[PDB]
Write a protein that binds this ligand. Structure first.
Ligand code: FES
Length: 98
């Protein structure tokens, strides 16, 4: 019901606990962290990250195709944690370089 989220940013790790019914980006902001975003609606690539451990539910978002979702990309503005999760943030360049 609350999961440990570790975010691997360009200048290192940050973790917090995040309820299973709160989006990861929302919770990160309640915790004082500043992450990239634009639409907050699952329809651009601005908030993109990559899951390196655990799983998320991001079915509220529509931007990613199945090859991107398969490579672990995630839209942090519309993603709920489903277990303890590790997510490397600021992945817009890499996603949009696929
Ligand atoms: S800010 Fe656009 S998909 Fe997250």
């Amino acid at each position: 019901a609350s999961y440990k989220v570790k975010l691997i940013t360009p200048d290192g790790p940050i973790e917090f606990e995040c309820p299973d019914d709160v989006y990861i980006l929302d919770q990160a902001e309640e915790e004082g962290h500043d992450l990239p975003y634009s639409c907050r609606a699952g329809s651009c690539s601005s908030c993109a990250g990559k899951v390196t451990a655990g799983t998320v539910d991001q079915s509220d978002g529509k931007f990613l195709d199945d090859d991107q979702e398969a490579a672990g990309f995630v839209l942090t503005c519309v993603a709920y944690p489903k277990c303890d999760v590790t997510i490397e943030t600021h992945k817009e360049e890499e996603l949009t370089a696929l």
